[PDB]
Structures are given as C-alpha cells and as structure tokens.
Amino acid sequence: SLQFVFACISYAVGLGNVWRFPYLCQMYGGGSFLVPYIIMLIVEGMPLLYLELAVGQRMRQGSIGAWRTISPYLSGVGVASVVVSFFLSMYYNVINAWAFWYLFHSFQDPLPWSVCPLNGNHTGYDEECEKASSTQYFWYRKTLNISPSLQENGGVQWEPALCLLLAWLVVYLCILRGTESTGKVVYFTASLPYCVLIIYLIRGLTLHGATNGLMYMFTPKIEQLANPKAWINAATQIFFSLGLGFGSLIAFASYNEPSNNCQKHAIIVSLINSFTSIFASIVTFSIYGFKATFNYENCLKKVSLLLTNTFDLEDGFLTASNLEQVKGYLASAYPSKYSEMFPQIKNCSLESELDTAVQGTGLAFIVYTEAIKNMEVSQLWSVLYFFMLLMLGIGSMLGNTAAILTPLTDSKIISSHLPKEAISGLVCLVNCAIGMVFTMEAGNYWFDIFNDYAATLSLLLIVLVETIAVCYVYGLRRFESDLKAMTGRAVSWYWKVMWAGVSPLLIVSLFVFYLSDYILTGTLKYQAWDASQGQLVTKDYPAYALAVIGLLVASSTMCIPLAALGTFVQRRL
Amino acid sequence: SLQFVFACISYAVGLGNVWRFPYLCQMYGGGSFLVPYIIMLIVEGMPLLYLELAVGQRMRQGSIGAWRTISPYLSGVGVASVVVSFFLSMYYNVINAWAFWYLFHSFQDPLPWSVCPLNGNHTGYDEECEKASSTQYFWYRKTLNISPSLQENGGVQWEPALCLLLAWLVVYLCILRGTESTGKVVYFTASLPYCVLIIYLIRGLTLHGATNGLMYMFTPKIEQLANPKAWINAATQIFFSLGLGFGSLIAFASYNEPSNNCQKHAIIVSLINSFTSIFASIVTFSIYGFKATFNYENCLKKVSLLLTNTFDLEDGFLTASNLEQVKGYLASAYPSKYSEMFPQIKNCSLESELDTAVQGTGLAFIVYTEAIKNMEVSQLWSVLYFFMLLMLGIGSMLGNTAAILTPLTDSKIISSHLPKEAISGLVCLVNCAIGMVFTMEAGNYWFDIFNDYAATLSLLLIVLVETIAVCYVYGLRRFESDLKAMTGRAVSWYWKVMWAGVSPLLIVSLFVFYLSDYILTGTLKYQAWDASQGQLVTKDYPAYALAVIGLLVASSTMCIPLAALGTFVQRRL
Amino acid sequence: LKSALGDKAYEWNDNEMYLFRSSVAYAMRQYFLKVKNQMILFGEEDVRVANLKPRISFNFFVTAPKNVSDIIPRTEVEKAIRMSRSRINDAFRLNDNSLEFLGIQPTLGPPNQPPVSIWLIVFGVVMGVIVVGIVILIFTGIRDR
Amino acid sequence: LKSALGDKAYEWNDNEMYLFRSSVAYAMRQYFLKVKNQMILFGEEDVRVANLKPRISFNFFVTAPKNVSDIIPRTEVEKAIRMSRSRINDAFRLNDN
Ligand SMILES: CCCCCCCCCCCCCCCCCC(=O)OC[C@H](COP(=O)(O)O)OC(=O)CCCCCCCCCCCCCCCCC
Ligand SMILES: CCCCCCCCCCCCCCCCCC(=O)OC[C@H](COP(=O)(O)O)OC(=O)CCCCCCCCCCCCCCCCC
Ligand SMILES: CCCCCCCCCCCCCCCCCC(=O)OC[C@H](COP(=O)(O)O)OC(=O)CCCCCCCCCCCCCCCCC
Ligand SMILES: CCCCCCCCCCCCCCCCCC(=O)OC[C@H](COP(=O)(O)O)OC(=O)CCCCCCCCCCCCCCCCC
Ligand SMILES: CCCCCCCCCCCCCCCCCC(=O)OC[C@H](COP(=O)(O)O)OC(=O)CCCCCCCCCCCCCCCCC
Ligand SMILES: CCCCCCCCCCCCCCCCCC(=O)OC[C@H](COP(=O)(O)O)OC(=O)CCCCCCCCCCCCCCCCC
Ligand SMILES: *[C@@H]1O[C@H](CO)[C@@H](O[C@@H]2O[C@H](CO)[C@@H](O)[C@H](O)[C@H]2NC(C)=O)[C@H](O)[C@H]1NC(C)=O
Ligand SMILES: *[C@@H]1O[C@H](CO)[C@@H](O[C@@H]2O[C@H](CO)[C@@H](O)[C@H](O)[C@H]2NC(C)=O)[C@H](O)[C@H]1NC(C)=O
Ligand SMILES: *[C@@H]1O[C@H](CO)[C@@H](O[C@@H]2O[C@H](CO)[C@@H](O)[C@H](O)[C@H]2NC(C)=O)[C@H](O)[C@H]1NC(C)=O
Ligand SMILES: *[C@@H]1O[C@H](CO)[C@@H](O[C@@H]2O[C@H](CO)[C@@H](O)[C@H](O)[C@H]2NC(C)=O)[C@H](O)[C@H]1NC(C)=O
Ligand SMILES: *[C@@H]1O[C@H](CO)[C@@H](O)[C@H](O)[C@H]1NC(C)=O
Ligand SMILES: *[C@@H]1O[C@H](CO)[C@@H](O)[C@H](O)[C@H]1NC(C)=O
Ligand SMILES: *[C@@H]1O[C@H](CO)[C@@H](O)[C@H](O)[C@H]1NC(C)=O
Ligand SMILES: *[C@@H]1O[C@H](CO)[C@@H](O)[C@H](O)[C@H]1NC(C)=O
C-alpha cells in the first residue's frame, strides 16, 4: 500500500519548488544561497510543520474555529491566513497562463523562439534579437512586450489576457467537478514530474560545458552569506513552499487522521519538499552553465575574428589560448593602428558572464526553451515539458483554492442565499478581473512587485504569532500531556525546545537585521530590460511604488491586532 | 464476453493462410485462381466442417476411438490422420527456422539484403546480385545457397541447421510448459497479426504503381480455369488451411461443448479463415505489383539510355512514350548502324514481366524483405513483422503438435514405461534429425517436393473416406435423429444433401480429371534457379523423384485398406 | 544535365566549354606541381576540343603550353584527372554519373564494418535463455513428481 | 578556408588564383551575354589582382579584352557577380560566409 506516500508527495509538490526556487537560487549566487536554505530548513522547517500538524489533529476544527477555541486573542489569524492565499491566487494564475501560451506556440516547425526575425533590408537578422538571444527576445517582446520603465503603464494586451482567461476557466472546471482529483491516479500525477526531470537531466548533462553550471551552483562564495537578504529570502522560500501559514495544512488534518502519527508524516513531507527543490535546481543550472559557457565562447570567437580581420592573420591562428600572447605581440607591431582600435576590443570573462546571463523572474522559461531547441525532436519535448509544468501548476492551484473555498462556506450567514457554485463563480470572476493587470504592457513589474513581498512579510508575521500563541498562551506541558493522552507517546525535548526557544528568536532577529540593513542603503532599485542593449539594468522605483507595497503589507498582515482590539471592545458593551 | 470469438480465431489462423495462400495464388494467375477458391469453399468448405464438428461433439472420444466405435471398417483412418500430421511437422518447422534467421539478420544498418556486394575489381556491383534483385540474391544465395539442379545433393549446410535446431528447441519448451497458452492473453495474440497487416497495407498502398498488383490479382483470365490443376490446388489449400483431416478438430470438440451449437461456431471459423486468406493476399500483391512496375520502368529506362548513347540524342529526349515513334524514325536514319545493334534492343512489356517476377515458394520472404527496405526505419518494422510471422508459425506448430501428442499417450501399452516428456523429446529429436535434409544445399527441392503432394493427396483420400463412411455406413436419418435428440434442433436439408450428394461426386471427378490430364502431357518439370541468368527455368525431375513421391503418397494414405484387411483376417482366427 | 539537375539544369552554351577547359587546365597544373615537381603554365587554349555534339559529348587532348607539336600522353592526363575529379564535378554540380570520362572509372566505395557478425551473439543469448528455461522446467517437473 | 573546410582544407597556392581568375572571367562572359546581348571574350588575363595577403584577401578589377586602358565599372562587376555567385562558391566548396 504505497498510495499514502504518493498522496503525500501530491500534497507536497507545488510551483514554488520547481519554478520559484531556481530563480531565487540564481538571484544570490546559488552556492551562497543554497547553504542558508539547508540551515533555515533544518532549524525551523521541520518542527513548525510538526507543531502545526499536531494541533490540527488535536482541534479537528476549521482554521478560524481552531484559533477561536484556543484563545480569544487569536481571532484574526484565521482571516489573515485566508486573505493571504486569496491575494496569492491572482498573481499565481498567470504562471499557468504563460505555460498554456508556450504550449499553444509549440505546434509548429520550427519553434518561434528558435530563429530570429529579419530586418527591413532582409540582409541580416534583427539586431534586437541578437543583443538578446533567440529566446530572451521572444520572452520579453513576443509574449510580454514589456516597457523598459515602470512609468509606462500603457494599454491592456490581449493575447496573455485571453490565455489567462482560459486558465481561470479550466480552474473553474476542475474545482466544480468535485473536491477531489486523486485516488488510483496518484501514481501517474506524482511520477510524471520526476520522470521528465530525469529525462531533462540526462539531456542537459550531455551538453558541453555543463560542469561549469554545477560547479558554480555548489561552491559557497562567502561574500553575500553576510547579507541577511538572502537569509530572509531563503526562509520565506521554505515557508511558502511548505504551505504553512496558508491554513490549508491546519485544515487538511482536521477531518482525518484519528490517532495516527504526525511526526513521521510531516518528516517525510518536508524531506521530500527539500529533495524536490534541490534536485530540480540541478538540471536547470547544468543547462544554465551550458548557456553561459556558450555565450562566453561566442564572445571570444567574435573578438578573435575582429582581430584576424583588421590587421591580417592566417585564419585559424587565434583560437582560444595564444590570444593573450598575440595580444602582446601586436602591441609592439604597429600601435598607431592598435591603440586606435583598442577601445573596440571586447573584454569578456567566464565568471562575470556566468554571474548574469539569464537572470530574472522568467529564468525557468528562458532556460528551458533554450534547452528544447537543442533537442532532436522539438514539438514533442516542448509539449511534454509544458504539460508537466501546467499540470503541476493546476494541482498547486486547486490545492490553494481549497483553503479558501472551505472556510467561507461553513459560516451559516453567508451560505444562506447562494450555494457554492455561485460564490465560486464570483470569486473566479473577481480574481480574473483583478489579475488582468499583469496583462498590461508593464505588468511584469507589478508581478515582481507582488511576488516576493506578499509571499514574505504577511506569512512571516502570521507564523510567529501562531508559534508564540500556541506556546506561551496555552502552555507547553498542557499540550504535551494532551498528546500523551491522545496518542500514547511522549514528545522529545527536541521539539519542546524548538517550539518556543530558538525559532521565535532567530526569525525576529533576522527580521530586525533585514529592516536595519534597509536603512543602511536607502531605497531600492528593481530591474529593467533596456531593449536597446539587451541586458538587465537596475532602474529605480517610482513614487507610488513604496505606497503600494505599504498597502500590500498592511492589508495582508495588519489584521491580528485588529482582532485583539475587537476583543477589547466586545468586553465593554 | 468476446473471448470466445478470439479463441475461435486463435483456433483458425495458421500459416497455410498467410504464407502458402499468396504463393499458391500467384502460381496460377491470381484472378484465375481466386474464383475457384471461393467456389470450392462455398460448395465443400462449410458442410464438411459442420459434419466433423457435429460428430466430434457426438462421439466425445479420441480420433481413433471415434472411428473405432463407428464401424469396424474404420480402424485405419485415425492412424492415417496421425501419420499425416507427423509427416507435416518436419517440413513445417523449417519455415519458423527461416523466420528466426531473417530476424537475427535484422539487427544492423543497413540490412544485408538492401545492398549488393562488390566484385573483385571494386568497380561495379556483383552482376550475380544485379540479374537478381538485391533481395532475390540474398534469398537464393546467402540463406539458401541452392544448387541449380537437383542432381547436386551436396553437403549439409550449418547456419540454417542451427536455426532449425533453435526452432525445435523453442517448440519443445512451449509444449513442455503445459498444454495451454491462451486465457486472458488471447486478445494480444489474435490482434497482433491483423494490426501489422493493416500497417503494411497502409504502407504498400501508398507505393507507386500499386494499383497494377490488385488489378492483376482480381481480373479473371479464363485460360487456366479450364486447367483442373488450379482446381485441385485450391481445394487442397482450403482443406489444409481448415485443419480438417488432421484430426485436431475432431479431437478438439471431444472433452468440450456439452450441448452448444456447432453450426454457428464452424460457420464463424470458416468465414474467418476465408477472410484472413483473402485479406492477407492483398497487401502482398499490392507490393508485388509495385515491384513489377518498378522492374518494368527500369527495363524501359535502360534501353532508352542505350539508345540515346549509341547514336546521339539530347538527354531526356526518350522518356516513356515517344520511344516507339523514335524507334521508327531511327530506322530510316541509318539502318547500317541500327540493324547492327537491333539484336541488343531489349523487348520488355509490363504484363509479361508482372506474370513472373518473384514467383516461387519463397515469395512472401522476397516480397516482404523488399518492402521493408523501403520503410522509413528498417530494423523496427523488420523485427516486428518477423516476430508476427514467427509467433503465428509457433502457434500453428503447437496446434499441430497437440494432435499427435494426445493420441499416442492414451494407449496404456506404450505409456507404461516412459512418461510424456520422454516420448516428446524422442519425437522432437527424430523430427529435427529427419528435417535436417532441407538444410542440404539442394534442400529446397526436397521442400517443394514434400509440400504440395503430402498436403494434398493423403488428406484428399482421408476426407472422402470419412464422408462416405459417416453417410452410407451409419445412416443419415440415424445421425439426424441423434442430433435432434442431443440438441433439440432439426438439421436443414441443406446439409442433408451436401453431406453425401454433391461433394463426394465433385471431389472424385476432379481427382479423376487431374489424374487424366497427368497422362495427356507426360512427366513434370519443377523449377530451377539458373544463377547465371537470375530467372526461374523449368528443369525436369530426376529418376528417383517419381519413386520418392510414390513412397510418400503410399506411406501417407495406403493405410485404410490395410485396416479393412486386418478386419478380414481378425474375423477368421 | 537533365539526369542530374532535373528541372533545374542550366543550358550548355560555349561559356560552359570555356569553364570546362579552364578546369582541366587547373587539374593539369596541380598534377605537374605535386608529382613531377615541375611548374608548367597550362592555359585554357592548350586544351583542344573536337566533335562537339548535342547529347553533350566530345573529345579533348592537352598539349604543352606553346609547343603545339607536343602532346601530353593519355595516361598522364588520366592520372591528373583521377586526382582532381571531385573538384571538376563540383564546378558543374555533377555527380560522377552525369560526367563520364570514358576510360576512367571511380573505385573508392568499400563499405565494411561487421565486428563479429553480431547476429550470432543475439542468437547465442537467445539459445542460452532457452536452455536455462528448459533446465529449470525439467527440474521443476521431475522434482514434483 | 579553415573556417569552412575544417580539418580538410586545401592549401592556397597560385593555381587556386588561376582558377579564381578563370571563374570571374566566366562570370563576366555570362553577364555580358545574357543582359547586354553582346559577346565579349574575357580571359583569365583580364582580371588584374593586387595586394595578395596570407589571411587570404586581395583586390581585383576587370579590363576589356585587349584595350588595357578600358576598365569595366565597379557596378557592372558587382551585378555580374551577384548573378553567378552560387557557382563561384561551388567551384571552391565555400558557402558565402
Ligand atoms: C472562469 C470564470 C467564470 C467561470 C464561470 C462562472 C459563471 C457561473 C456563475 C453562475 C451564476 C448563476 C448561477 C445559476 C444557478 C442556477 C440557476 C437557477 O437554478 O435558477 C432557477 C430560476 C431561474 O429562472 P427561470 O428561467 O425561471 O428558471 O430562478 C428561479 O426561478 C427561482 C426564484 C428566485 C427567487 C429570487 C429571490 C432570491 C433572493 C430573495 C431576497 C434576497 C435577495 C438577495 C439575493 C442573494 C444574492 C447574493
Ligand atoms: C477571502 C476572505 C475569507 C473570509 C473568510 C472568513 C469567514 C469567517 C469570518 C469570521 C471569523 C472571525 C470570528 C469572529 C467571531 C464572530 C463574531 C460573533 O460571534 O458575533 C458576536 C455576536 C454579538 O456581537 P455584537 O454585535 O457585538 O453584540 O453574537 C451573536 O449573538 C451572533 C449569533 C450567532 C449566530 C449563529 C450563526 C452561525 C454561523 C457562525 C459561524 C461563522 C464562523 C466560522 C467558523 C467555522 C468553524 C466552525
Ligand atoms: C540524503 C537524503 C536524506 C538521507 C536520510 C535518509 C532517510 C533518513 C530516515 C530518518 C531516520 C529516522 C527513522 C525513524 C526514527 C525517527 C528519528 C528520531 O527518533 O529522532 C529523535 C531523536 C531522539 O534522540 P534523543 O535526543 O536521544 O531523544 O533525535 C536525535 O537525537 C537524532 C538527531 C539527529 C539529527 C538529524 C540528523 C542530522 C543532524 C546532524 C547535522 C546534519 C547535517 C545536515 C547536512 C545533510 C547533508 C545532506
Ligand atoms: C506416428 C504414428 C502414430 C501411431 C499412433 C497409433 C496408435 C494406435 C495404433 C493402433 C490403432 C489401430 C487399431 C487396431 C486394433 C488393435 C488390435 C487389437 O486389438 O488386437 C487384437 C488382440 C488379439 O489379436 P491376435 O493377435 O490376432 O489374436 O486382442 C487382444 O486380446 C489384445 C488385448 C488387449 C489389451 C488391452 C490394451 C489396452 C490398450 C489398447 C488401446 C490402444 C488403441 C488406442 C485407441 C485410443 C482410443 C481409446
Ligand atoms: C530440440 C530437440 C531436443 C530437445 C531435448 C530432448 C532431450 C530430452 C530427452 C530426455 C531423455 C531422458 C529423460 C530423463 C527422464 C528423467 C530421468 C530420471 O528420472 O532417471 C532417474 C534415474 C537416473 O539415474 P540416477 O543418476 O541414479 O538418478 O534412473 C533410475 O535410477 C531408475 C532405475 C531405472 C530402471 C531401469 C529399468 C527400466 C526398464 C526395465 C526393463 C525394460 C527395458 C525397456 C526400457 C524402456 C526404454 C524404451
Ligand atoms: C463478404 C463477407 C461475408 C458476407 C456475409 C456476412 C456474414 C453472413 C452471416 C451468415 C448468415 C447466416 C446467419 C445464421 C443463419 C444460418 C443460415 C442458414 O440458416 O442456412 C440454411 C438455409 C436454410 O434454407 P432452406 O433451404 O429454406 O432450409 O439455407 C439457405 O437456403 C440459404 C442459402 C444461401 C446460400 C449462401 C449465400 C450465397 C449463396 C449464393 C451464391 C453465393 C455467391 C458467392 C460469392 C460471394 C462473394 C463474396
Ligand atoms: C579590458 O581590459 C583592458 C586591459 O585592462 C582594459 O583597458 C584598460 O581600460 C582602463 C579603463 O577602465 C584604462 O584605464 C587602462 O589604461 C586600459 N589598459 C591599457 C593597457 O591601456 C579595458 O578597458 C577592458 N575592457 C573594457 C570594456 O573596459
Ligand atoms: C521485340 O520485338 C521485335 C519486333 O517484333 C522483335 O524483332 C523481331 O524478332 C523476330 C524473331 O523472333 C524476327 O523474326 C523479326 O524479323 C524481328 N522484327 C523485325 C522488324 O526485324 C524482337 O525479337 C523482340 N525481342 C526479342 C528479345 O526477341
Ligand atoms: C616540341 O615537342 C617535341 C616533342 O614533344 C620536341 O621534339 C623533340 O625534339 C628533340 C630535339 O629538339 C628530339 O631529340 C626528339 O626526338 C623530339 N621528339 C620527338 C617525339 O620527335 C621538340 O623539340 C619540342 N620543341 C620545342 C621548341 O620545345
Ligand atoms: C580603349 O578604351 C578607352 C576608354 O575605355 C577608349 O577611349 C575612348 O576613345 C574615344 C575615341 O577613341 C573617345 O571619344 C572617348 O572619349 C574615350 N574614352 C575615354 C574615357 O577617354 C579607347 O578608344 C579604347 N581603345 C580602343 C582601341 O578601343
Ligand atoms: C538597409 O537596411 C537598414 C536597416 O537598418 C536601413 O537603415 C538602410 O537604409 C538599408 N539600406 C538600403 C540601401 O536600403
Ligand atoms: C598560437 O600562437 C602561437 C605563437 O606563435 C603558435 O605557436 C600556436 O601554433 C598558435 N595556435 C594556433 C591554434 O594558431
Ligand atoms: C576487373 O575485374 C574483372 C572482374 O570481372 C576482371 O575480370 C578484370 O580482369 C579486372 N581488370 C583488371 C585490370 O584487373
Ligand atoms: C518525344 O518525341 C517527340 C517527337 O519529336 C517530341 O515532340 C517530344 O517532345 C518528345 N518527348 C520528350 C519527353 O522528349
């Protein structure tokens, strides 16, 4: 009966594990971001999930109902957890939208991203498609057509709008046909991702210069480990990938698990999450090292050609090594021609290029599409990989939607007029109509604005409130005795210390150091595309930027003290 | 519960249906052989099978036991039926041997029959491989190395010997692991042949000039319908393909079928046999018409090239049509050069070529291997088709072996010392050691000697004896009443007349006309390979040829009057 | 031309004959440089052409540069053409069957790569699994009697 | 040569220059026959070559057959080369890059 473990993996695997993790890893050197991940996981990944599953089996009640019965001070954590996932779903659906788009654009020969367009003269390729590669251009222009600045709001684009519409429609269909999609089918949906990842690992590992990718991803470079931004980002990636804080897990083990063990189950799920992350982040980086070394060799060959053309030299004389020697020998040759061309000599090195080659929030897309054009058959692997990604996305999507469809339908006041199908349609409708914003020309700016902050700050506050409450408002020994009574086992001091001792201190120390290094530099610069050059410049935020993040974080996690105040006023009459 | 019909097809499909039928069809014009087949099938194919299945359900006893209980005059028909299949198995196994061989020779690139060898000068291809095609050479030389005459016995060849050994070994394994191979697996083994035949039909139907093959196979040309040889050959092909006379069918419905209907079952099986034959004989002949028209176009282009080279003419001037016109215009041009080359002008026409292009007992091999080299991938379709053929062969093989393993083990005198595994090993051993003869250099001559006659004459005698006995020794009305009593149905006069009225007369009239037209011409000429030219010349039989066919037919069907005599002497003491 | 280039062939005017004479002169230069170690300046007017026909076909022969009575023997011209045939073909887009130098045949086409006649090893492994199944089955049969 | 033919390239001696001059003369003949409708007998000695370098590179220009002071304008040589470029490439096994 292996079905339980495959069901557990189904619970586990999401899209912050396969898509967000590689991007966030690359964003901070990789090797100098990987070790912090393991650290924060070992020290606050496991015990928090243990505690949450334990209290979920204990109370056997809804998210809001559990914290209502626990304490009066704890009325707003449930509604905060609901609105968090509510805000999540909107900007979460556009990823499925893009996967749909790339799938639809793969029924051809050749693939549209595989060849650059032509100029008006029909002589050479479009230089816009040459500064960027054959893929990056297709990503930032064809499917996005982003504006180089944020100040250019612009008009709504309609192809991604339509694709997002279809995504929301298929979401609605999957939710409307029952609150289940597993059972005798879990094997298929749980084995597909691993299988395609193995195939793509075999592919991307027989690619030249792939070793550089792994070498760069693994080496720890101790210069940004002293930056707490990577620390908080890793902590948040773990929190968001494990579904904690959202309340889906505290609600999953409510009408289930009479007296089974939560420690073993949670340990399996957390280990599988970490293994999925660390494995899926190896194929991408092998391929990314391949892309980096190819770009480097191309730069080298181009400058060698310019050199052998300008003065004169037997072809094949400046290949890869003697260049420097030649570079010297041509200095004393005739500097009256050498100095006058020196400002054109391109100066490119491998590690500097490998640092920033494909970076950005669309990393997975640009690297995978670059790897698919290198296959033997193209449409097949394309549609297979994109179907895998879309299926994982829709699975995570329905998982997220459960945690919001359930806690709104149980209240007997709101579900008196309309049944569930009606309110489900209304929420899908408002969700699409608000997420249309990312379809705008400068929509990816809103996307990267939303993602990190709305996934980080509110969740980090709610989890700390949950822990400090369950520990120092209910009593550790009381819950220990309750578990000893319900299951017949004694908790180890291992969790006894880790539930209130270390993690509550470490998380707030990291938060304070994050908010303190925020004032050591000033305001922040996000990104920009610079189509004229084809790289990622670092334009600054506009005025209303800070304001909109302020309202985001406020509306996301300023609800717990409001329930604390409501308790104060409801005790006075 | 569709399993019964697929079991019936399993009972039905053999190798005289897929391999022997196309060869025998081509041997006599095809269209002028197809209609006689339908005639003899409708008039004596169905009712004889009906009668046999009926009496098998009636007696519910062994082959020899049934005819022992029926009448005393009927003791030798069982042993004759046994020795017939015994003689069959030997020369039947070499086909599986050849299929194994061709399978083993298909794990390469390119396929060995696809390219001709070189000469010692390394300038042009071996002319031996050019007179014959790239396949015919591989068939008559590589896997056979036949001698141009029968008088050249020669030494034993060892590669086909070894392959036949492996064939007998796998026969022994399949028989030793139970007396069954079906059950929840019948779908696969019954659907494989049809599926591959559909694929090969789709292939061979998108080949240029394929219409000529079907057109030739279907048109009746009324010049050999007046030859009774085609008549007897078609009758025998039907008899041998339907497993009658061998006793396997009279024994199959013995420990089975308590009171079910035999008419419907036998009708289904006979219709399915005929449909399988007529369908499988369409893909081969489409491909064979393709091969014919290709050979014709090649002849035409070669002579056009010789013409345009010898005098002088703009290239591309003699393509396919104006040739005759040109052929005229070059007569008055300079006959002092035209007459002196006229004896070299090749004179080739489409129908004369299509008459004899691949004819011979290896027809299926030479045409299918020629069709496989024309595929997109080669090893795949090769091994698939040969595995299909080998599986059908081994199925028919175990079916044949059952009808001889059963009736020898029931006698309590012979099965007192040794169990079944021992005697099975002994019979496989003697069968291999006698079938080694076909491995000889001039072994195919022995093969074609055995096939037609041992499959025709003995079977035709045994069936007529069976019919005349069951009708005019037991009484038609008596058996009619017995069936009315056992099953509760009244036989139609349809079978009442056809069991003794028409078929007993027609079969002996055809036999007499066959043996009468044998003396209107004299002795017979069989075939010959003429490696020096690459066609099929018609060498005459040697002296001992007639003697060996005489002993074959005697030993095969001179056992019924011997039992009639044994009854005479066992009534005198 | 019709055979090789199909429905794409160029027409054969006299500029094609000029290019052909130039190709043959180059082929002779190369041979006399790389073998005889001399250096002779053949031109396109030392290749004499005769009997031009429409089915495309003619004779030619090569003389010394200015000594018109001096004719390079046939054997050496054949040698010099074997050496550079693959280049003269490419100059006209022909493939050694649409450009025949009667009396010169190409004979470098030998295919051979069977290491062990690999059919035999597959037969052997199949025979091995056959005999191991047979022995296991006679084992199980005679034992359980 | 090293770029195109890889580890198969021929060396470039003066017979290659002879063949190149012959190819260009043929290309000029064809153009003047199929466009100007004239018929001029250019030879391999009406293609003047200058500044031969080892990185393979030189200048050339074409004159009338025997009137050495008569130079075909640059534009017409470019036209005549566009017309037969795919043939000059094939003569040397080069691919337009
Ligand atoms: C991808 C994103 C979009 C996906 C797709 C979303 C679209 C789904 C949205 C569906 C919205 C409508 C759901 C239809 C449900 C079944 C329709 C049906 O059965 O109708 C029968 C039927 C429809 O009309 P018929 O044509 O006569 O059958 O309605 C009735 O006759 C029942 C009588 C209704 C009584 C009205 C009084 C109710 C309120 C009382 C006073 C309080 C007012 C507050 C109202 C509460 C509203 C919040
Ligand atoms: C996307 C956003 C998601 C939103 C989802 C949130 C859904 C639940 C929001 C409310 C949760 C916060 C709890 C606040 C406490 C309720 C206030 C109150 O009781 O009023 C005092 C109220 C008096 O307050 P006063 O106005 O100050 O006098 O007491 C009453 O007399 C009300 C009578 C109760 C009527 C029974 C109705 C049964 C439905 C209740 C179930 C709803 C809770 C869902 C929990 C599920 C677990 C089973
Ligand atoms: C490489 C992929 C993962 C490899 C592991 C394969 C699967 C391991 C199965 C887990 C074994 C547990 C089986 C069931 C028993 C439950 C365990 C238990 O009772 O715990 C309470 C157990 C009870 O001990 P007590 O203190 O005597 O009560 O707690 C412990 O003392 C064990 C502490 C071990 C800490 C975890 C192991 C690693 C810690 C050291 C630093 C690790 C470096 C990280 C680098 C990793 C690189 C990949
Ligand atoms: C590859 C060739 C295949 C060969 C397979 C043929 C196997 C059977 C061959 C014999 C069939 C011909 C029937 C001839 C009649 C037998 C002669 C006779 O009875 O002797 C008279 C014999 C007297 O003859 P006398 O020598 O003239 O006095 O009567 C006896 O007293 C013999 C005592 C009988 C002993 C019982 C033995 C039980 C085994 C008998 C079963 C064998 C028949 C198989 C049929 C299966 C149906 C159940
Ligand atoms: C591909 C074609 C080839 C396929 C492969 C074919 C090869 C299979 C052939 C197998 C032949 C041998 C079968 C072995 C059967 C099991 C062996 C076994 O269990 O032996 C135990 C055993 C073998 O010797 P062990 O090494 O002491 O075990 O034999 C005995 O000890 C039993 C004592 C035997 C008594 C002998 C007296 C029997 C006859 C009495 C007088 C009448 C004489 C007439 C004889 C009748 C012969 C027709
Ligand atoms: C094309 C593939 C085959 C097409 C046939 C599809 C399947 C047919 C299912 C058979 C129908 C029988 C269903 C069950 C009833 C049993 C029949 C029955 O009762 O028979 C006794 C039935 C009883 O009649 P009674 O004489 O009144 O007792 O006998 C007959 O009278 C029917 C005679 C029909 C003869 C067979 C049909 C063809 C004969 C005419 C010449 C045929 C030309 C051949 C050329 C063919 C070209 C392809
Ligand atoms: C690549 O390296 C060369 C050599 O270091 C750089 O040339 C130097 O450029 C700096 C300006 O940053 C000058 O101050 C130095 O004088 C230059 N070196 C010499 C020897 O003159 C070159 O600038 C680098 N590439 C780029 C794009 O800056
Ligand atoms: C192909 O057809 C031609 C024309 O019919 C044949 O030439 C005739 O051959 C016969 C011999 O069988 C002579 O008697 C005739 O005189 C020939 N015709 C003429 C016009 O002279 C030719 O023989 C045929 N091909 C072959 C191989 O025989
Ligand atoms: C032109 O070539 C011919 C032969 O190819 C040369 O004739 C030879 O001349 C020498 C002396 O001049 C004689 O000894 C030979 O016997 C001649 N050979 C033949 C075959 O007759 C002739 O000399 C050459 N002329 C020039 C100017 O080089
Ligand atoms: C050689 O070519 C030059 C120019 O290519 C010819 O010069 C022309 O001569 C005519 C009269 O002879 C003058 O009217 C033109 O003005 C001249 N052109 C130039 C550009 O000066 C010259 O005639 C040609 N010589 C021959 C013998 O054909
Ligand atoms: C060639 O195309 C370029 C496009 O950048 C254009 O600027 C230029 O004018 C064109 N040249 C001609 C001669 O049309
Ligand atoms: C690189 O330059 C050095 C210096 O002369 C030379 O020895 C070497 O062969 C050159 N390598 C290549 C590949 O040209
Ligand atoms: C060329 O090969 C053939 C083979 O038929 C042979 O008869 C002939 O002598 C060979 N020619 C030479 C010159 O070796
Ligand atoms: C065949 O010959 C006739 C007779 O002149 C001619 O009209 C026709 O074009 C020729 N066809 C071909 C394909 O050469």
Numbering used by the authors:
A (entry chain D), B (entry chain B): 11 to 583
C (entry chain A): 624 to 768
D (entry chain C): 624 to 720
Paper text:
Angiotensin-converting enzyme 2 (ACE2) is the critical cellular receptor for SARS-CoV-2, directly binding with the receptor binding domain (RBD) of spike glycoprotein (S protein). The CLD of ACE2 is reported as the chaperone for membrane trafficking of amino acid transporter B0AT1 (SLC6A19) and SIT1 (SLC6A20). Here, we report the cryo-EM structures of the full-length human ACE2 bound to the RBD of the SARS-CoV-2 Omicron subvariants BA.2 and BA.4/BA.5 (hereafter referred to as BA.5) at an overall resolution of 3.1 Å and 3.2 Å in the presence of SIT1, respectively. From an overall view, the RBD binds to the ACE2–SIT1 complex with a ratio of 2:2:2.
